[PDB]
Design a binder for these strands. Structure first.
Ligand SMILES: [Cl-]
Ligand SMILES: [Cl-]
Ligand SMILES: [Cl-]
Ligand SMILES: [Cl-]
Ligand SMILES: [K+]
Ligand SMILES: [Mg+2]
Ligand SMILES: [Mg+2]
Ligand SMILES: [Mg+2]
Ligand SMILES: [Mg+2]
Ligand SMILES: [Mg+2]
Ligand SMILES: [Mg+2]
Ligand SMILES: [Mg+2]
Ligand SMILES: [Mg+2]
Ligand SMILES: [Mg+2]
Ligand SMILES: [Mg+2]
Ligand SMILES: [Mg+2]
Ligand SMILES: [Mg+2]
Ligand SMILES: [Mg+2]
Ligand SMILES: [Mg+2]
Ligand SMILES: [Mg+2]
Ligand SMILES: [Mg+2]
Ligand SMILES: [Mg+2]
Ligand SMILES: [Mg+2]
Ligand SMILES: [Mg+2]
Ligand SMILES: [Mg+2]
Ligand SMILES: [Mg+2]
Ligand SMILES: [Mg+2]
Ligand SMILES: [Mg+2]
Ligand SMILES: [Mg+2]
Ligand SMILES: [Mg+2]
Ligand SMILES: [Mg+2]
Ligand SMILES: [Mg+2]
Ligand SMILES: [Mg+2]
Ligand SMILES: [Mg+2]
Ligand SMILES: [Mg+2]
Ligand SMILES: [Mg+2]
Ligand SMILES: [Mg+2]
Ligand SMILES: [Mg+2]
Ligand SMILES: [Mg+2]
Ligand SMILES: [Mg+2]
Ligand SMILES: [Mg+2]
Ligand SMILES: [Mg+2]
Ligand SMILES: [Mg+2]
Ligand SMILES: [Mg+2]
Ligand SMILES: [Mg+2]
Ligand SMILES: [Mg+2]
Ligand SMILES: [Mg+2]
Ligand SMILES: [Mg+2]
Ligand SMILES: [Mg+2]
Ligand SMILES: [Mg+2]
Ligand code: NA
Ligand code: NA
Ligand code: NA
Ligand code: NA
Ligand code: NA
Ligand code: NA
Ligand code: NA
Ligand code: NA
Ligand code: NA
Ligand code: NA
Ligand code: NA
Ligand code: NA
Ligand code: NA
Ligand code: NA
Ligand code: NA
Ligand code: NA
Ligand code: NA
Ligand code: NA
Ligand code: NA
Ligand code: NA
Ligand code: NA
Ligand code: NA
Ligand SMILES: [Sr+2]
Ligand SMILES: [Sr+2]
Ligand SMILES: [Sr+2]
Ligand SMILES: [Sr+2]
Ligand SMILES: [Sr+2]
Ligand SMILES: [Sr+2]
Ligand SMILES: [Sr+2]
Ligand SMILES: [Sr+2]
Ligand SMILES: [Sr+2]
Ligand SMILES: [Sr+2]
Ligand SMILES: [Sr+2]
Ligand SMILES: [Sr+2]
Ligand SMILES: [Sr+2]
Ligand SMILES: [Sr+2]
Ligand SMILES: [Sr+2]
Ligand SMILES: [Sr+2]
Ligand SMILES: [Sr+2]
Ligand SMILES: [Sr+2]
Ligand SMILES: [Sr+2]
Ligand SMILES: [Sr+2]
Ligand SMILES: [Sr+2]
Ligand SMILES: [Sr+2]
Ligand SMILES: [Sr+2]
Ligand SMILES: [Sr+2]
Ligand SMILES: [Sr+2]
Ligand SMILES: [Sr+2]
Ligand SMILES: [Sr+2]
Ligand SMILES: [Sr+2]
Ligand SMILES: [Sr+2]
Ligand SMILES: [Sr+2]
Ligand SMILES: [Sr+2]
Ligand SMILES: [Sr+2]
Ligand SMILES: [Sr+2]
Ligand SMILES: [Sr+2]
Ligand SMILES: [Sr+2]
Ligand SMILES: [Sr+2]
Ligand SMILES: [Sr+2]
Ligand SMILES: [Sr+2]
Ligand SMILES: [Sr+2]
Ligand SMILES: [Sr+2]
Ligand SMILES: [Sr+2]
Ligand SMILES: [Sr+2]
Length: 237
RNA sequence: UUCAAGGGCGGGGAGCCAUGUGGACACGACCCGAAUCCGGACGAUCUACGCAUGGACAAGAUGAAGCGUGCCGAAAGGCACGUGGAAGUCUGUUAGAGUUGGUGUCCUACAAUACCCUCUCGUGAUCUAUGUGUAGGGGUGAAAGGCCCAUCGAGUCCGGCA
RNA sequence: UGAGGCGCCCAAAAUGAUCGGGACUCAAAUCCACCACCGAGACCUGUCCGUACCACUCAUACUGGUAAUCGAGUAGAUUGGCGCUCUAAUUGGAUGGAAGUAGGGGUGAAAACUCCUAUGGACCGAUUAGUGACGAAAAUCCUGGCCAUAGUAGCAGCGAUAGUCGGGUGAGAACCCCGACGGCCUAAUGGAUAAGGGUUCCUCAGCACUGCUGAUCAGCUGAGGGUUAGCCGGUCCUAAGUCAUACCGCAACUCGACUAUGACGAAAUGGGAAACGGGUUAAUAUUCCCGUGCCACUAUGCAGUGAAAGUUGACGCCCUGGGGUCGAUCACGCUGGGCAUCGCCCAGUCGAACCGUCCAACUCCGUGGAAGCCGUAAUGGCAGGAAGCGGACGAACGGCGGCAUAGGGAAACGUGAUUCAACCUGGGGCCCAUGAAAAGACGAGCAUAGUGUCCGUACCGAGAACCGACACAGGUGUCCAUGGCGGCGAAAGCCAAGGCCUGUCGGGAGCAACCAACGUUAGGGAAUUCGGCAAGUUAGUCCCGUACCUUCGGAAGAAGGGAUGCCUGCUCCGGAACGGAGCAGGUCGCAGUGACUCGGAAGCUCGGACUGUCUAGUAACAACAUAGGUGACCGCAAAUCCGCAAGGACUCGUACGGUCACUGAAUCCUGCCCAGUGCAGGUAUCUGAACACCUCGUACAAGAGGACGAAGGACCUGUCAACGGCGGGGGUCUUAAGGUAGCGUAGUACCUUGCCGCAUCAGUAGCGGCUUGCAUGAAUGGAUUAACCAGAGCUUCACUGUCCCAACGUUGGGCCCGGUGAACUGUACAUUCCAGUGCGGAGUCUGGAGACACCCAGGGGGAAGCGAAGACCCUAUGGAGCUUUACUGCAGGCUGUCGCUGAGGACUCUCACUCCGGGAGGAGGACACCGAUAGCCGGGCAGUUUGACUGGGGCGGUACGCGCUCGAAAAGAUAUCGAGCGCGCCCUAUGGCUAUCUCAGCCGGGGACCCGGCGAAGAGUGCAAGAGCAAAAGAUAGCUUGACAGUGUUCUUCCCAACGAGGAACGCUGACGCGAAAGCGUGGUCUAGCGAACCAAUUAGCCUGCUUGAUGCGGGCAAUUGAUGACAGAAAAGCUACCCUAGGGAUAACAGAGUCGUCACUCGCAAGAGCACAUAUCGACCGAGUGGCUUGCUACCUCGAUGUCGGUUCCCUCCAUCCUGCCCGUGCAGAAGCGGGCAAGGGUGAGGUUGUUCGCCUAUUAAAGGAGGUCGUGAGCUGGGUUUAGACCGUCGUGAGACAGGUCGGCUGCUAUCUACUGGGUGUGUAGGUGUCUGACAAGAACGACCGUAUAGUACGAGAGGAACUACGGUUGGUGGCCACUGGUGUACCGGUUGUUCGAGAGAGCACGUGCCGGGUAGCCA
RNA sequence: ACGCGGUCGAUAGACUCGGGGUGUGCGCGUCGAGGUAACGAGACGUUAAGCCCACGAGCACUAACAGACCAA
């Protein structure tokens, strides 16, 4: 047959690329030698096209102007701190080791100094649980207990823009506008609605996947469609 | 070959070469005749979809939130009028886009997809120009096997090839 | 009373009857005889030829001889010869005329040879031996040329109907130019331009070419000429993004991703230093020239120390205030023009960049001091300081002054105002959407001077300059969006500025038929049709008023009702408008949204929620999307995906994420099932590869085995919003469960037009209800649903030429004339018609009939018309796309192992390697990545296969390998999907021999046993059938292993007649068994019980392996066993309606033809009943026929196409007669029924469901008959149904996909050559003229039918009821004609009136060929 | 193609009547709701008006003239 849509994606042609030339910046934590002698002033609040959430423009002492992944509650004028000796307050960044257990954190690093990888989406937050000299335990938004180097930097507070998902798009047009700001091909034609030549589920008088949808993990691309290595399906049991 | 016997093959000197010709096999194999398959190339001046930079949408209708005034109420609020001007909102041959029916006209055409009337959309998932990207078992596809220069259930060109 | 001969009845078919025809009757018939003739290429006979043979001969050279016993021929075999090219040898011809060509003479059976004459003007032969790109009627053959077609189609159709009269030029003028008159275009038919074109631009001279006719013209031809820039583009910047170099990959590169660097990337339309006005040319022009101005750089001089912070460049969508120019308009003045019943109408009244100046809004400061005020269109503002007052900063492409005794104008050479595009500046709102960058500029003065190069510059920009082969009705971007009336308007309609008469052939006929567009139609009003298709109805605005239902938004402009002009004078809102809303009075018309513009309305049902998407070019939908619902994967060194790799998308992303799927708004809901399949988890035990390890083997190795055992499987569990499933039976069974809520005859229900009801005169429709659901049912989503819809179906009101039933008219064609001028098609012949025949569907054959030639117009019956090597069907050891648990493989994932890889069945470490980090260093770590290999999964991908037979194919079957009987026709052989029926073994005895013996069955004496008799065979003999067998081939007993080894002959397999395996009979040799012996035993009495090569194993001996010896392990001779049943041997599944090719009438579908079981109809016999009574009437059984309407059968015609059903329209026919006419019978009183006879003249109609045919139904009727004509009729119509491509449901299928089920949508080409006919002409014949006739022939339905009255309330009859002859009046259908009457038309005409233009008036144009409305003469019509 | 007339003529047109269609012309005068007036839709009279006719009659005024040819 012909390659399925999932395979066209991989080629990275314009149709499937994100509008990177329109994205602002990558809210990665600042790099400080040591001391925490770094503080900046929130100069403005902006809209981040790549995340549909607000971002805070900050001006640091040493003269560096950079956008930051803002938690909820940060406003113009406010002063933020970044470093080991940073004050324990919303909007400030410091290594987990300095954060007190039971404090909601966001933009958590996976490996000390990487800039932040976890809990960066609207209204989410990781929960710092256990402390130690060898391992900091964090409960990520998915509910998973993650073991991180106490040296991994993070920001206090939850990510700005919470509740974004509570309002329905209501119309295709609204979905449309949002999709135009992401690396995604939309709308979506169902596999069962295509010709046999175009998808494993295509073909047949009436629409239906003439086969079980739960596909094996070992399936090759082009065949791995439907419910990938499902441990179970449905709502029952 | 055979305890044995019986079979098979061969045996009392004619061949070798040349020229013409009959016929066989491989090769194009008396000549033309078709749908393929494969290789390397050339196409996104059409069109599909994306991106960049620009452009277009008379006029009218309806009258959401919000706000106001008055009245009622302890209050929460309610009621009336006004204001306001929302909307993949309505009418609309505005521009522009499209095409339900006539199974009209045409059907060696004006035209290898045209003409007329009727019809639909017309502030948005809108329409449109130019630039730009994606290439052949690959693209692109709100999916019709649609579209990728009058050609697509696998483009075109030349070659494989007689 | 029997028999025979001929005939009669029985006896009905479709265009025109037939024995071939005429026609024949003591025959021209039939039968019995006879007589004489005609009549082939046969037979006889003369001559000749060929061939075979004979004699003679070197001869196949002559000559002679023989043929009663020689003479036809497709495929094919054999042999002699003709012609063409060039070579060679020998030998000739030609300028006293070669070859070729044309016409003609002679020869040869013929291929072909040869001569003559004319032309021609230079080459040409013969013989012999060679050579070969050597012979054409054909291939939908190729190329070129050419005829008919034909002076034919086109040069008309488009909302752009365009001209006419004079004149100019010229050899020539409808279309080249001038004037007048008349028109066309207004987002274009005008102005400026982008792309693209490329000289098309201007001038002169031309008309052979090009131009839909002509041409003096031109985008054509010839020759010249034309594009001028510091300030308009380019050039500069960067955008998406591209390339180059480096680096890396790759076998490699012109290939490839990242990361660096550099460059490239915007001419209308991104950013951007600076130019305006006028004049000038045939053609350029912000470029030249005149006037004025401006920018950048540089130099000089003065000033300046500032200089980089900041600002700008620089930005989305929606609403809106303020400032404000042009334009437009109003008021008044000036200048000029127009008009002339008035006094109006038109134009102009100008003047730039630039320099200077003014500043509203926003922001801010001072003052002030609000506790309720300030302000807006709106939001809003304020003790964190409102209003007010003052101030800083600060706008226009704007105002004002200069510019300007510049320019421009014939002149005047204005002034105010309103509405205000441009442009300037603010306020508000929206985002799960956030609306470029860079160069540059400002910041940062002035004088003077110098420099400012390079490239583009014409023209078109489109119904003739671009693309579409064209001077193509198509396509093609930008700006002019503010010209006047109009009105809501960038709408219509009319008119300016400007453009044009080139959406380029004309002339003529009251101008016929017919067609395209269109106007008007009395009465009826959807009767038309599948369907109101088409057309129409409604319509603008204001007032009143508005239902069910609803998601409370909506439904809604629901519906329904009323008003609407003009004139006079006013009121209200507003600053005002040349803005809006009303009032009073007057008044005209048929009509006041007067034209134009401008909704028909309502209800029920199905589907999809909605806007949106789609098959460029037959599908716009119910299909796709969608928000919403749901499930799955993944913590980021992730999941998913691309790349061979280097690397990459997702991703400037991080679970409120984004990937993979399903369902498809809201609302109420979403049951049961984990057995199979899928996925996932677990797993004692079982199973599970390679490496390493161990044993055997080998001096080594191959190899055999063992131990260990990863993923995987077995096994267990979870999971259905995972594939899917929810039956049959009984009051459980398969296979897990056994269908819950709902809905239900459905777009799912075959039965089926289900049943009831509604509605209609009548309703296969539709709606409601019931519902056992052939075969509904819950995210394969169920139900339901307001709103929405060019979606499917139904009903109503209104309206109407859809119809009854057609008419008249309008414009363009059509017809005639000038000019221009194709194509399709053509084996030939061709004036046909009726029948027949024929490969059964003939203009050409046969028989008749008819037929004087040619031409014009027509509508299309036929040429199975033209156009396409049938799309349907089958066939091919064809193709392709698609599917899967088909065959075989390939990627990919998982997993073990080896290398990378290090130190001290579980562990630590660090040093390789990986990752994070700017770095230090941190994390990880011998793992991971990567290289190699092994096991599992693996339609993601590739190549293939998927057989044959067959009354076409599929399904079914196997007549696909064997045996018997019959078919089989008395030797042998012999077919069909022919009839009956078997074999794929079984048996160590059920084999072999010998001895002894005789069996079924029946009878007699004491179903077991014993005795006797009869008993040729009916028993038994393994199994089909047919056959064989009695001191046996059977039985019993005993013994035995010949069911043995080797090797043949012959027959069979395969008649004849070649072919393997297999089989049989018969031998020889060896060794045996039994018997006295002869002899018997090569399995079972005979005919079924079977298998190649390659490979393996096995048996016994021997041969052999690369210099040589030994050992291992191989190779071979002979044979046994292991299977291919598609059985003389491939390893092997499907779909295609997305399809494709080659062919087939070798093979199906429609139709034809044959048949006639079926069907229709008839006849014979007449049981039976009809109260009695065969025969008034009904009529079983059985028997005999006719037809060719039904169905079946066949495969004869046709696959290089003969278009389907139904309907429609139009014509002819048949009779087996429904009515009408005339009759007979009656269980006939009458009236009326019932049955029958002659008879085809005429008639046989309108409607409801349904595509329907048929049929069911309704009201009428004299009756509302049936059938044939290719189931007449698509070069006539329709397109509802059938029958492609899209889609849905049910059922089936794992799936692709299917269904002889349902359902929505879905394209109909052509200019007529011949023939045929309807009408119209010209000629010839009879044979200068006029007028009048005749009548062979030919056509008719010219007439058919009904009602009523008198007869008559009579005859008849108890009564009830109730005729006829005949004479009348009328209706209906058909027919021919006519217009006084009624009606229609009537773009003659007259009138009314809306918008606009001509100033008003008068009088007119346009609004489609009448703007609209009213009336209507002639004529034509019903 | 056919039919009629051609001066021995009414064949066609002009003109005039007749017969028809429409519906009361231009202009002027009076009136006219009003309005100081200007002005004024419309009404009445003149007006069986005006305009028009594919028909008929009369009428040689114009045109059927002039004239060419064939023919037993
Ligand atoms: Cl989303
Ligand atoms: Cl010869
Ligand atoms: Cl330019
Ligand atoms: Cl404002
Ligand atoms: K055929
Ligand atoms: Mg970031
Ligand atoms: Mg996008
Ligand atoms: Mg979808
Ligand atoms: Mg599809
Ligand atoms: Mg597939
Ligand atoms: Mg393009
Ligand atoms: Mg309002
Ligand atoms: Mg004779
Ligand atoms: Mg010689
Ligand atoms: Mg030749
Ligand atoms: Mg031939
Ligand atoms: Mg013709
Ligand atoms: Mg033209
Ligand atoms: Mg009518
Ligand atoms: Mg009907
Ligand atoms: Mg319609
Ligand atoms: Mg006022
Ligand atoms: Mg339905
Ligand atoms: Mg829809
Ligand atoms: Mg289409
Ligand atoms: Mg549509
Ligand atoms: Mg669905
Ligand atoms: Mg369920
Ligand atoms: Mg489904
Ligand atoms: Mg035909
Ligand atoms: Mg064919
Ligand atoms: Mg194939
Ligand atoms: Mg395949
Ligand atoms: Mg025999
Ligand atoms: Mg084999
Ligand atoms: Mg063996
Ligand atoms: Mg065989
Ligand atoms: Mg084909
Ligand atoms: Mg045949
Ligand atoms: Mg046949
Ligand atoms: Mg009869
Ligand atoms: Mg009677
Ligand atoms: Mg008749
Ligand atoms: Mg019939
Ligand atoms: Mg037919
Ligand atoms: Mg026909
Ligand atoms: Mg047709
Ligand atoms: Mg035709
Ligand atoms: Mg239908
Ligand atoms: Mg399909
Ligand atoms: Na192939
Ligand atoms: Na393109
Ligand atoms: Na249409
Ligand atoms: Na391809
Ligand atoms: Na041809
Ligand atoms: Na012309
Ligand atoms: Na819409
Ligand atoms: Na299961
Ligand atoms: Na079901
Ligand atoms: Na729609
Ligand atoms: Na009509
Ligand atoms: Na015809
Ligand atoms: Na295919
Ligand atoms: Na096969
Ligand atoms: Na069968
Ligand atoms: Na044999
Ligand atoms: Na018969
Ligand atoms: Na028909
Ligand atoms: Na009759
Ligand atoms: Na036919
Ligand atoms: Na047709
Ligand atoms: Na038909
Ligand atoms: Sr990052
Ligand atoms: Sr980083
Ligand atoms: Sr499917
Ligand atoms: Sr459940
Ligand atoms: Sr493009
Ligand atoms: Sr809309
Ligand atoms: Sr609209
Ligand atoms: Sr249609
Ligand atoms: Sr029409
Ligand atoms: Sr067409
Ligand atoms: Sr194409
Ligand atoms: Sr080739
Ligand atoms: Sr012969
Ligand atoms: Sr012969
Ligand atoms: Sr014309
Ligand atoms: Sr046309
Ligand atoms: Sr000439
Ligand atoms: Sr550049
Ligand atoms: Sr304004
Ligand atoms: Sr055009
Ligand atoms: Sr003009
Ligand atoms: Sr012309
Ligand atoms: Sr009329
Ligand atoms: Sr109807
Ligand atoms: Sr369409
Ligand atoms: Sr729902
Ligand atoms: Sr399971
Ligand atoms: Sr039930
Ligand atoms: Sr014709
Ligand atoms: Sr059949
Ligand atoms: Sr025997
Ligand atoms: Sr199957
Ligand atoms: Sr289909
Ligand atoms: Sr008869
Ligand atoms: Sr009768
Ligand atoms: Sr029926
Ligand atoms: Sr039929
Ligand atoms: Sr018929
Ligand atoms: Sr149809
Ligand atoms: Sr003659
Ligand atoms: Sr009586
Ligand atoms: Sr007109």
């Amino acid at each position: 047959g012909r390659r399925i849509q999932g395979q066209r994606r991989g080629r990275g042609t314009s149709t499937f690329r994100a509008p990177s030339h329109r994205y602002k910046a990558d809210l990665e934590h600042r790099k400080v030698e040591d001391g925490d002698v770094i503080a900046g002033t929130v100069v403005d609040i902006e809209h981040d096209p790549a995340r549909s959430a607000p971002v805070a423009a900050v001006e640091f002492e040493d003269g560096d102007r950079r956008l930051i992944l803002a938690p909820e509650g940060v406003g113009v004028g406010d002063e933020l701190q970044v470093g080991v000796s940073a004050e324990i307050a919303p909007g400030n960044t410091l290594p987990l080791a300095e954060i007190p257990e039971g404090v909601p954190v966001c933009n958590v690093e996976s490996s000390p100094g990487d800039g932040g990888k976890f809990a960066r989406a609207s209204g989410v937050n990781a929960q710092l649980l256990t402390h130690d000299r060898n391992v900091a335990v964090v409960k990520l938004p998915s509910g998973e207990m993650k073991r991180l180097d106490p040296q991994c930097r993070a920001t206090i507070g939850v990510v700005a823009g919470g509740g974004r998902t509570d309002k329905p798009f209501v119309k295709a047009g609204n979905k449309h506008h949002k999709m135009k700001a992401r690396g995604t091909k939309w709308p979506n034609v169902r596999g069962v609605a295509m010709n046999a030549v175009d998808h494993p589920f295509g073909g047949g008088g009436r629409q239906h996947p003439g086969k079980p949808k739960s596909i094996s993990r070992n399936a090759p691309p082009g065949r791995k469609v439907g419910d990938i290595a499902s441990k179970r399906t449905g709502r029952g049991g």
